[PDB]
Amino acid sequence: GSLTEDGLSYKEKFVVRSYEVGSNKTATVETIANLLQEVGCNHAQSVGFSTDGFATTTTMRKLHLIWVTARMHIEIYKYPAWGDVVEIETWCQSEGRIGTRRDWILKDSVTGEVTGRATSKWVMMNQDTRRLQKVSDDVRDEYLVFCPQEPRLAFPEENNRSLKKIPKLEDPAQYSMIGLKPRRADLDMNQHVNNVTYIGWVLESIPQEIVDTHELQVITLDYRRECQQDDVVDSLTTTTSNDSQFLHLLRLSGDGQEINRGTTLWRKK
Amino acid sequence: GSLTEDGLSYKEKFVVRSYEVGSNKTATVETIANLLQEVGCNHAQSVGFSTDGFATTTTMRKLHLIWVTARMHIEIYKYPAWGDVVEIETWCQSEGRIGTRRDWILKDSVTGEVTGRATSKWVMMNQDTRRLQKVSDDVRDEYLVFCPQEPRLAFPEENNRSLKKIPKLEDPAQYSMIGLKPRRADLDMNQHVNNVTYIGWVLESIPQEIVDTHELQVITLDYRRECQQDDVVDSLTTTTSDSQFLHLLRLSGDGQEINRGTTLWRKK
Numbered sequence: 001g002s003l004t005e006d007g008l009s010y011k012e013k014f015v016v017r018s019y020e021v022g023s024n025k026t027a028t029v030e031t032i033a034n035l036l037q038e039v040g041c042n043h044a045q046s047v048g049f050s051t052d053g054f055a056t057t058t059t060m061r062k063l064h065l066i067w068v069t070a071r072m073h074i075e076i077y078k079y080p081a082w083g084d085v086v087e088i089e090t091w092c093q094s095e096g097r098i099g100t101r102r103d104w105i106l107k108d109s110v111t112g113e114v115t116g117r118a119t120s121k122w123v124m125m126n127q128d129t130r131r132l133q134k135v136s137d138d139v140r141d142e143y144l145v146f147c148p149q150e151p152r153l154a155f156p157e158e159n160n161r162s163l164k165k166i167p168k169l170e171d172p173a174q175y176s177m178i179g180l181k182p183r184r185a186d187l188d189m190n191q192h193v194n195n196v197t198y199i200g201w202v203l204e205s206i207p208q209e210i211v212d213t214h215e216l217q218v219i220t221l222d223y224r225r226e227c228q229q230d231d232v233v234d235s236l237t238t239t240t241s242n243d244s245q246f247l248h249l250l251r252l253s254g255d256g257q258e259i260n261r262g263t264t265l266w267r268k269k
Numbered sequence: 270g271s272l273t274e275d276g277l278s279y280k281e282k283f284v285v286r287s288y289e290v291g292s293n294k295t296a297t298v299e300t301i302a303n304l305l306q307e308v309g310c311n312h313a314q315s316v317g318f319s320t321d322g323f324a325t326t327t328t329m330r331k332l333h334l335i336w337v338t339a340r341m342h343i344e345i346y347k348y349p350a351w352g353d354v355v356e357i358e359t360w361c362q363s364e365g366r367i368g369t370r371r372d373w374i375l376k377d378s379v380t381g382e383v384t385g386r387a388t389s390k391w392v393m394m395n396q397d398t399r400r401l402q403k404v405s406d407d408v409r410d411e412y413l414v415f416c417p418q419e420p421r422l423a424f425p426e427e428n429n430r431s432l433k434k435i436p437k438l439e440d441p442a443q444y445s446m447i448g449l450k451p452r453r454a455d456l457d458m459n460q461h462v463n464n465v466t467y468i469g470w471v472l473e474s475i476p477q478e479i480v481d482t483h484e485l486q487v488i489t490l491d492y493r494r495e496c497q498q499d500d501v502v503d504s505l506t507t508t509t510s511d512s513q514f515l516h517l518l519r520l521s522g523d524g525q526e527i528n529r530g531t532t533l534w535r536k537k
C-alpha cells in the first residue's frame with residue numbers, strides 16, 4: 001500500500017483469503033469491514049500517527065484524547081470472490097469541531113469498477129473520563145496537513161442513507177440472538193472489542209433464510225457505548241419492509257443498556 | 270505465493286495486519302493458525318485440488334470422501350510483529366493407509382530465521398455417513414504426484430511432542446469458560462466451524478494473568494467430533510506443571526467430548 005501522488009489519500013490491494021468468504025465464496029461484510037480498518041490503519045501510520053493502537057496525533061497524546069467510532073455505513077455492489085484482488089482507497093476529512101470522517105472506495109483491481117463505498121464518523125473523547133468533547137484548533141490544524149481541503153465525499157447524494165437518523169427498536173423484537181460474548185480474538189491490541197465484532201453481532205439475529213436467499217447491500221450502524229470484555233450482549237432485529245429491510249438493536253443482557261442501533265437493506269439474489 | 274522450483278512444496282509471504290495482533294503487538298496463535306490454513310489452501314489449488322472448499326481429489330469426489338483434521342500441533346519461537354512479513358513454506362505427505370500429514374515452517378522474511386513450525390494429521394471420512402476409513406491406493410497415487418517421496422518432517426525427532434498421547438481431563442477442572450457458541454464469522458464457506466475457532470475456545474479458559482505474563486510456545490490439539498452451528502461448548506483447563514496445561518472442549522449439554530489438548534507457556 002501507499003499514499004497517492006498528492007499525499008492526500010492512501011491505496012492498498014488485498015487478495016481475498018479462503019477463511020474470509022461465506023457460502024457464495026465471496027467476502028463477508030465483516031471481511032470487508034476488517035479490510036477497511038486495516039487500510040485506515042496503514043494510512044494513519046503513513047502520515048505520522050502513533051503506532052500504539054490508538055492512532056492519535058501529538059496534541060491528542062498530550063491531552064489524553066482518543067477518537068471513538070460514532071457510525072459506520074457500508075454499501076456493497078459486488079463482494080469480491082475468494083482469490084480476487086480488491087483495491088481500497090481511503091482518506092479523511094475534518095468536520096469542524098464536530099469530529100472527523102474517514103471514507104473509502106472499493107474497486108475490482110482487474111476491471112477498475114467501483115464495487116463498494118463506505119463512510120465512518122468519529123468523535124473525540126477523553127481516554128480517562130470517557131467524556132466526549134469538541135475537536136480543538138490544534139487538532140484541526142493537524143488534519144489540514146493530510147486531508148483534502150475541498151470536500152471529497154464517498155456519499156455525495158442530497159439526503160443520502162449514510163446520514164439518516166435510526167430509530168430505537170420497540171419490544172418485542174421479531175428475531176433475537178441472546179447471550180453473545182466476546183472472546184480474545186474479538187479484542188484489538190488495546191483489549192477493547194473490535195468495531196467489526198458489533199457488525200457480526202447485529203447480523204446474528206438475521207434469519208439464516210434471508211442470508212441464504214439475499215445479498216446484503218447496505219448496513220448503517222450507530223455506536224453509543226462500548227461492550228466491555230466481561231459484558232454479554234443480546235442482538236434484536238425486526239423487519240421494517242424485491243428488497244428486505246431490518247431495524248437492529250444491540251443491548252447488554254444484564255440491564256438492557258443500548259450499545260448500538262442500525263439498519264440493513266438486502267436484495268434478493 | 271508459488272510452488273517451489275521442484276513443485277513439491279509451496280511458499281507464501283504475509284504482512285501481519287493491525288487486527289491480527291494481541292496486546293504485545295505480535296500475531297496471536299489464532300492468526301498464525303489462519304495463515305497456516307490459507308497457505309495450505311493456496312498449495313492445494315496450485316496442485317489441482319477442488320475449489321469448492323472441500324479440497325478433494327478426483328477419486329475422493331467420485332467416492333464422496335473428505336479429509337477431517339485429527340490433530341494440529343504448533344511450536345512458535347517468535348511471533349511476528351504488526352507490519353512484519355512472515356514467509357510460510359508448506360508441504361504434504363502420505364502416511365500409507367492411515368491418513369495424510371501437512372507440515373509448515375515459518376520464517377522471518379528479513380532475517381531468514383525459522384520462527385515457528387507446525388504439523389497436522391488428517392484422516393479420510395465418507396462425507397454422507399461421517400464414517401472414517403483407510404486411504405485407498407488411488408488416493409495414495411494422487412498424493413505421490415505432489416508430495417516428496419523421501420520423508421520430510423517439520424518435527425523429525427523420534428518420540429517428539431507432536432506425536433504425544435493426550436489424556437482426558439478429570440472433573441473438577443481448575444478453570445472453565447462455559448456457554449461458548451459459534452457465530453457466522455466462525456464458519457467456513459461450507460458452513461462447518463473453522464478449525465481455528467476450536468483453538469480460540471481452548472485458550473478462553475486460560476486465566477488472563479497467564480496470557481499477560483507468558484508467551485505460548487507449544488499447542489497440541491486433538492479433534493474428535495465437530496461442533497455444529499447450533500451447538501454450545503464448555504472449555505475446561507487444569508494446570509499440570511514453564512507453565513503447562515491440559516485442556517478439554519465438550520458440548521454444554523450432554524458433555525460429549527469434541528477436542529482435547531495441551532499448551533506449554535514460557536514466562537516473558
Ligand SMILES: Cc1cc(C)nc(N)c1
Nearest residue numbers: 068069070223224225226
Ligand atoms: C458516539 C459515542 C458516544 C459515547 C459516549 N461513547 C461511544 N463509544 C460512542
Ligand SMILES: Cc1cc(C)nc(N)c1
Nearest residue numbers: 337338339492493494495
Ligand atoms: C479424528 C476424527 C474422528 C471423527 C469420527 N470425527 C472427527 N471430526 C475427527
